[PDB]
């Protein structure tokens, strides 16, 4: 029993992290097979970041200007390419630790693990959600760019996120592994607005189900509700609206606990309109939205990976 | 910027996890060099757990009764030994992935990462604290026993915890890697009382300093206080008392932020006596005590490991 914000085991990713240096700037890269993926702003100095012309800047750089380092071994860059916002640095040797991997573009509200790295060296791992406004509330210091987010199917690592920027508001932005930003952000040091951040309702419901499974039942209320009437209240508290797809996704959790999804919605609705009155749920005084319904089933059923 | 409950990268540990089977029971083992460490109650059936005579039970078991499996390879048990509450299963092959390691007995209030495993296969990693009552509030399903907790010095893994038991209260108990339980617990399925759990005050102060560093300053109050007067209030709220050693440990955080330790104590004292009034600190509505002063400096300075 018990419930924790669990990250995926990071080993399969740790062996893919390299240090990329272009000029003075050094950040992290992802060494899969014979391509090193890293943020293209590695080619930028502090001045260039304010208004970078990446095509022009990249053209002033040559293969020999990129120093890729993995531990105390050096990789030779035999080719460089820019895909949207990622640099593809083709090196001469394929990473012998290359796991079975997938590149995926996740949707807001999905969770993944981040391996936070500095100088190509892992410092820690934590689980987070892609906010509905396509930011992440991470922990990234200077030099952590190129840190990646991932999910692990049993033997297959799904890379979904590469860190690029800390917005001036202190939240973090990045791309998928094809270099396409999540959200409306660009890799330039300018003020950039993230949209209104909403709470991921289906995740909160998932976590409520986890709370029931772990014995926290006090929020099971006397009421029920409709999906239309629930969404009316959720809109007021900046919760994303619930769809039938979300109900369908919560099906197994409803079956395991004997609590229909709309009955849990009535409990959540009451939690929103009346708060938690100095009480907790799974140790939290706030409603948690960084567990998907799949995270809950995974943790409550103990699925493992390679 | 930003702050997250970061776990250590788990790769160095993942390659040490094996599956141990004795009779019907299967749990996790730790394969270091040529010794597999696992909970001795692997030799127990469900009935034996209520009143196990481990010496007698172990004597009824032979080397060929222990099936150690790592992936799809089998390890041959060439010897078995019981050290306090751990079984030492000497196998014929030394783990080629054996990291530089240390066995350490940590003190209550210290943090470490747990690699939660089932059938010898990693399912997730999370950071936790050893409570002052020598329990841990983990996430362990059936078959997760033998999961280990660890810290990572740059290249050296310090194993500090092996999971053995979920207490009937749903909290978790285990041993160091020499088999000595943390706390007054025994590995038998009987009601076992954990002491009063207190909040780890020096950790809460560390996390306050992290909050200042990350821009959460509203709790910096108009007051100051003495170490004697602070401990008077902390005792009322089930906070462990603060020593000069704790003050000395917080020294660097005090230097970085320009806030004397006793001034932070006055802020914490006010937080205790008056609550947080529906406000948050680093995203939390509760005071967090699972970051040590070293965790904060580590995360705020971005120290890395092998």
Curated annotation (Swiss-Prot), chains A, B:
Active site: 41 (for 3cl-pro activity), 145 (nucleophile)
Chain residue numbers at which the record places covalent cross-link Glycyl lysine isopeptide (Lys-Gly) (interchain with G-Cter in ubiquitin): 5, 90
Outcome following mutation: residue 132 to H: In strain: Omicron/BA.1, Omicron/BA.2, Omicron/BA.2.12.1, Omicron/BA.2.75, Omicron/BA.4, Omicron/BA.5, Omicron/BQ.1.1, Omicron/XBB.1.5, Omicron/EG.5.1
Regulation of this protein's activity per its record: Inhibited by pyridone-containing alpha-ketoamides compounds 13a and 13b. In turn, alpha-ketoamide 13b (tert-butyl (1-((S)-1-(((S)-4-(benzylamino)-3,4-dioxo-1-((S)-2-oxopyrrolidin-3-yl)butan-2-yl)amino)-3-cyclopropyl-1-oxopropan-2-yl)-2-oxo-1,2-dihydropyridin-3-yl)carbamate) inhibits SARS-CoV-2 replication in human lung cells. Inhibited ex vivo by michael acceptor inhibitor N3. Inhibited ex vivo by compound 11a and 11b.
Impact reported for residue 145 to A: Complete loss of 3C-like proteinase nsp5 cleavage
Subcellular location: Host cytoplasm; Host Golgi apparatus; Host nucleus
Record field: catalytic activity: TSAVLQ-|-SGFRK-NH2 and SGVTFQ-|-GKFKK the two peptides corresponding to the two self-cleavage sites of the SARS 3C-like proteinase are the two most reactive peptide substrates. The enzyme exhibits a strong preference for substrates containing Gln at P1 position and Leu at P2 position
Peptidase C30 domain ranges (all copies): 1-306
Residue intervals on the Cytoplasmic side: 1-306
UniProt effect for mutating residue 142 to A: Does not affect ability to cleave and inactivate human TRMT1
Self-association and partners: 3CL-PRO exists as monomer and homodimer. Only the homodimer shows catalytic activity. Interacts with host FBXO22; this interaction promotes the proteasomal degradation of nsp5.
Task performed by this protein: Cleaves the C-terminus of replicase polyprotein at 11 sites. Recognizes substrates containing the core sequence [ILMVF]-Q-|-[SGACN]. Cleaves and inactivates human TRMT1, preventing tRNA guanine(26)-dimethylation of tRNAs. May cleave human NLRP1 in lung epithelial cells, thereby activating the NLRP1 inflammasome pathway. May cleave human GSDMD, triggering alternative GSDME-mediated epithelial cell death upon activation of the NLRP1 inflammasome, which may enhance the release interleukins 1B, 6, 16 and 18. Also able to bind an ADP-ribose-1''-phosphate (ADRP).
Protein name: 3C-like proteinase nsp5
Native organism: Severe acute respiratory syndrome coronavirus 2
Parent-record interval covered: 3264 to 3569 of 7096
């Amino acid at each position: 029993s018990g419930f924790r914000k669990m990250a995926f085991p990071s080993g399969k990713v740790e062996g893919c992290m390299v240090q990329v240096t272009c000029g003075t700037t050094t950040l992290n890269g992802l060494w899969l097979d014979d391509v090193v993926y890293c943020p293209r702003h590695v080619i930028c100095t502090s001045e260039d970041m304010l208004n970078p012309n990446y095509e022009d800047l990249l053209i002033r750089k040559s293969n020999h200007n990129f120093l890729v380092q993995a531990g105390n071994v050096q990789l030779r860059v035999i080719g460089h390419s820019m895909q949207n916002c990622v640099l593809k640095l083709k090196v001469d040797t394929a990473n012998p630790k290359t796991p079975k991997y997938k590149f995926v573009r996740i949707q807001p509200g999905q969770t993944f693990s981040v391996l936070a790295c500095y100088n190509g060296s892992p410092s820690g791992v934590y689980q987070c959600a892609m906010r509905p406004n396509f930011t992440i509330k991470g922990s990234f210091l200077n030099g952590s760019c190129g840190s990646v987010g991932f999910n692990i199917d049993y033997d297959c690592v799904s890379f979904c996120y590469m860190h690029h920027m800390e917005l001036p508001t202190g939240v973090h932005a990045g791309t998928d592994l094809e270099g396409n930003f999540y959200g409306p952000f660009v890799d330039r040091q300018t003020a950039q607005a993230a949209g209104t951040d909403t709470t991921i309702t289906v995740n909160v419901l998932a976590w409520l189900y986890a709370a029931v499974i772990n014995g926290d039942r006090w929020f099971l209320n006397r009421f029920t509700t409709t999906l239309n009437d629930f969404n009316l209240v959720a809109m007021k508290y900046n919760y994303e609206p619930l769809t039938q797809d979300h109900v369908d996704i919560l099906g197994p959790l409803s079956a395991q606990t004997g609590i229909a999804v709309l009955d849990m919605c009535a409990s959540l609705k009451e939690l929103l309109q009346n708060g938690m009155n100095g009480r907790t749920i799974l140790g939290s005084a706030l409603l948690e939205d960084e567990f998907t319904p799949f995270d809950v089933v995974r943790q409550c059923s103990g699925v493992t990976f390679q």
